[PDB]
């Protein structure tokens, strides 16, 4: 997630992993989703949890 | 509920004193009395209005005090022809105008007009249909009131309309609901009234008037104690037909 | 001014264009209406709000307005097309501007009454009164179009339907005075001062709207005419 | 205060719907235009796109 002028850039990518423990060795990119049309000064995010 | 009744009965006083008539109320109103005087005959005339301000055309001789549950009038000035009943009305509860057995005073012992039309015998054939008409002020801004008066009873209310501006609903009285419909006609500025299901006490002599103006917004600069108030915002009594029952 | 060709031509059972194109100010944020008059009669409207016409005219006649242009279609033209056609538009300047006039040449109640001519007088002054009755004269507006003998149509006044605002041409400004009567229905035009230039017949329009073009720019519309007095105005 | 709109009553005193629209040039980026037009896709040929 940026904070650019105009646009959010929300990135994502959904990769396989088997070794469990922690951020895996490999080289993956983030393929843009949705850029967000919205102009906001954010300064601060929160994750939600169920 | 507010009864007002008056103190004096006959004041038979000579010319060239002072007079006094005092009225009370059981609760406790505000500065909402209002003086008439009625010839006999004639039609009555508001003498002073809010107990604060007089009118305009009447002389100066009618100088009045009082506030809260006591009220009373200080003529200190000579009768010249003020052979007249002087009534009183509270202006407080606008959909309860009501009036008191005002006291008969003896000596010893204008483009605004309104007319009526509708009267005669009422046994044969219980449904009347009177008038209105108005050719002074412009008809549709103001509410029309009506006001009978039983044979040496005095002053009863009967019921207005409202104007067309604060909704057109109505409101009569507790001996009238349900057998007196008013309706108005502003498209021809005649007011009417339906008599259905009358009955021998219904004899009275009925008078329509104005009401309160629905645009304020001239009421605002000018103040309430000059003849413009009293021209353009307040009631106009006129003429009074007759009803006639047998057996 | 509203550009306008002075003479066309078209054969029985084929389809004509009428353009009538103008500025930005008063055919582009307004809407134009069409007219035709019959040699020696009085005009009738026939295109409305562009898109729109009246019970009186048939389907046959196509209009519409593409930016600032309007064109006027006759889609099968007969022989009784043979008349002068107006455009009408109303320029935020508070004028109201006409057109040039077609000469479509072929190659095969409501009651508007006006009086007052004779002796004009031109210096002195004189009365020109229009009735009117039968259409609801408090609502429906009026106006003033003259038409000199060989020449267009000229638009003199116009008086909205309450009696309020009214506005003046650029070369009458100043010297007519247009009032109306509510109780007596008639239509009163105060003419002072009339030039050797105002040899027309004075036609009494009537307006399908109620207040002036100003504010209803999409509305406003002369359908029923009337036989204006020819005036004699000479040396 | 109330109108009190009737049929019986002549033009000027009848309800007039006005839909009055406005536009503003804020901060943040225009998300209303205008229709795009478009054009017929050509094939190989030295034209402007």
């Known amino acids: 997630f940026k904070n650019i002028d105009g646009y959010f850039k929300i990135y994502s990518k959904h990769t396989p992993i088997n070794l469990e423990r922690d951020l895996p060795q490999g080289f993956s990119a983030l393929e843009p989703l949705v850029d967000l049309p919205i102009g906001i000064n954010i300064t601060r995010f929160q994750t939600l949890l169920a | 509920e507010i009864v007002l009744t008056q103190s004096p009965a006959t004041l038979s006083l000579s010319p060239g004193e002072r007079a006094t008539l005092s009225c009370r109320a059981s609760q406790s109103v505000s500065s909402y009395l209002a003086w008439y005087q009625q010839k006999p005959g004639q039609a009555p005339r508001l003498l002073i209005y809010?107990?604060?301000n007089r009118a305009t055309g009447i002389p100066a001789r009618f100088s009045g005090s009082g506030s809260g549950t006591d009220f009373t009038l200080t003529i200190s000035s000579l009768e010249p022809e003020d052979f007249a009943v002087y009534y009183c009305q509270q202006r407080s509860n606008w959909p309860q105008y009501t009036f008191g057995q005002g006291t008969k005073l003896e000596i010893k012992g204008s483009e605004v007009q309104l007319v009526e039309s509708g009267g005669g015998l009422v046994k044969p054939g219980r449904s009347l249909r009177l008038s209105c008409t108005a050719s002074?002020?412009?008809?549709?801004?103001?509410?029309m009131s009506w006001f009978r008066q039983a044979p040496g009873k005095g002053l009863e209310w009967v019921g207005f309309i409202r104007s067309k501006a604060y909704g057109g609903t109505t409101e009569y009285a507790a001996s009238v609901k349900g057998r007196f419909t008013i309706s108005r006609d502003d498209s021809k500025s005649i007011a009417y009234l339906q008599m259905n299901s009358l009955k021998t006490e219904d004899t009275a002599v009925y008078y329509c008037?104005?009401?309160?103006?629905?645009?304020?917004?001239?009421?605002?600069?000018?103040?309430?104690?000059?003849?413009?108030?009293?021209?353009?915002?307040?009631?106009?009594w006129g003429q009074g037909t007759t009803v006639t029952v047998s057996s | 001014v509203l550009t306008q060709p002075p003479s066309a031509s078209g054969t029985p059972g084929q389809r004509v264009t009428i353009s009538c194109s103008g500025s930005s100010s008063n055919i582009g944020s307004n809407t134009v209406n069409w007219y035709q008059q019959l040699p020696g009669t009085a005009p009738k409207l026939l295109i409305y709000s562009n898109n729109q016409r009246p019970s009186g005219v048939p389907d046959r006649f196509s209009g519409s307005k593409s930016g600032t242009s309007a064109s006027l279609a006759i889609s099968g033209l007969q022989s009784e097309d043979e008349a002068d056609y107006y455009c009408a538009a109303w320029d935020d300047s508070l004028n109201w501007v006409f057109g040039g006039g077609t000469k479509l040449t072929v190659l095969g109640e409501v009651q508007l009454v006006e009086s007052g001519g004779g002796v004009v007088q031109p210096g002195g002054s004189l009365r020109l009164s229009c009735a009117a009755s039968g259409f609801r004269f408090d609502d429906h507006a009026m106006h003033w179009v003259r038409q000199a003998p060989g020449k267009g149509l000229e638009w003199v006044s116009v008086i909205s339907g309450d009696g309020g605002s009214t506005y003046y041409a650029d070369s009458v400004k100043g010297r007519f005075s247009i009032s109306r009567d509510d109780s007596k229905n008639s239509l009163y035009l105060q003419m002072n001062s009339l030039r050797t230039e105002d040899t027309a017949l004075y036609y009494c329009a009537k307006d399908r709207s109620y207040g002036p073009p100003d504010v209803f720019n999409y509305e406003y519309g002369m359908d029923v005419w009337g036989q204006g007095t020819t005036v004699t105005v000479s040396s | 205060q109330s109108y009190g709109f009737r049929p019986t009553y002549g033009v000027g005193h009848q309800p007039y719907r006005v839909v009055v629209l406005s536009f503003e040039l804020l901060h943040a980026p225009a998300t209303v235009c205008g229709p795009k037009k478009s054009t017929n896709l050509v094939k190989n040929k030295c034209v402007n796109f």
């Open positions: 008037t104005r009401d309160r103006y629905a645009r304020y917004d001239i009421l605002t600069g000018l103040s309430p104690a000059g003849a413009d108030y009293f021209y353009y915002a307040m009631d106009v």
């Open positions: 002074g002020f412009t008809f549709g801004d103001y509410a």
């Open positions: 809010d107990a604060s």
